[PDB]
């Protein structure tokens, strides 16, 4: 990226590295608006131009929003898919080559699986958890093994990569979740992929736009992206992890009648057990 390069959306990827604590400066990885990101964006723009589809989705969402979560409406229609990293960004962050493969992936709160699918080619077996009925159906159409939310900790095997993308701010017990993850991650070579939207603002999605506060508190604190990232090493340490690498990445989402796509600000970490 260049300081005068147009249409690179620098604000999606740069941080003020001097605002990071020294240990985080050493492991920050710069990401860029790459080919796979642009395909997602160009796909979303096209989709947002299918007016009859958008109008149908918007009428169904309006009629049934009182009876079903937003997540379940999206899974019902197959809409509003999201993007965290391209295969290239995922591989550069994990430091693996395009052909690297291992045994088992577990993707917790996998949504409709369109982010899971970026990671899937690197694994022989893919497992996932999810609370939304329609999202479970989307995961099963992708042939992922859906485990109960208290089933994955008790399978009798460990997981070589556990991904926990944008769930910590949406689940009831994030600290119990992190500790469960550590207890079943393969310890000699396993890694955790974690994504968090900053500013950290957690809640538990319910029906009808309703929501609840989580029953466990993550101690994420700061006045900007960098300070909040700075609070995370100690949060991960409590759960038995150190950050091996991390990056800033736009958390992209397909659009609707009003915008071609939507953006949130993701911090994405590779954790190793300690």
């Amino acid at each position: 990226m260049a300081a005068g390069g147009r249409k690179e959306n620098h604000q999606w990827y740069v941080c003020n590295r001097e605002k990071l604590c020294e240990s985080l400066q050493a492991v920050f990885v710069q990401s860029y608006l790459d080919q796979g990101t642009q395909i997602f964006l160009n796909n979303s723009i096209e989709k947002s131009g299918w007016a009859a589809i958008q109008a149908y989705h918007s009428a169904v969402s309006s009629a049934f929003s009182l009876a079903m979560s937003r997540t379940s409406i999206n899974g019902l229609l197959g809409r509003g898919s999201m993007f965290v990293f391209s295969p290239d960004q995922f591989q550069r962050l994990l430091k693996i080559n395009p052909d690297w493969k291992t045994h088992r992936l577990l993707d917790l709160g996998a949504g409709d699986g369109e982010v899971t699918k970026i990671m899937s080619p690197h694994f022989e077996e893919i497992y996932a958890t999810e609370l939304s009925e329609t999202m479970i159906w989307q995961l099963q159409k992708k042939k992922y093994r859906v485990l109960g939310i208290n089933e994955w900790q008790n399978t009798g095997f460990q997981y070589d990569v556990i991904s926990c993308l944008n769930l910590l701010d949406r689940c009831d017990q994030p600290l119990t979740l992190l500790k469960d993850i550590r207890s079943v991650l393969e310890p000699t070579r396993g890694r955790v992929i974690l994504a968090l939207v900053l500013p950290f603002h957690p809640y538990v999605e319910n029906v009808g736009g309703k929501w609840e506060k989580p029953s466990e508190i993550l101690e994420i604190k700061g006045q900007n992206w960098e300070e909040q990232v700075n609070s995370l090493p100690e949060v991960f340490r409590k759960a038995g992890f150190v950050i091996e690498a991390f990056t800033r990445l736009p958390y992209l989402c397909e659009g609707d009648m009003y915008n071609d796509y939507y953006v949130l600000d993701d911090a994405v970490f590779v954790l190793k057990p300690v």
């Binding site: 918007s58 937003r70 898919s81 700061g222 909040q228 989402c253 609707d256 009003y258 953006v263 949130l264």
Partner: peptide, 12 residues
Amino acid sequence: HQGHSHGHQGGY
């Protein structure tokens, strides 16, 4: 209007 599927974002 559905917005971002992850929900609405607050501030620091």
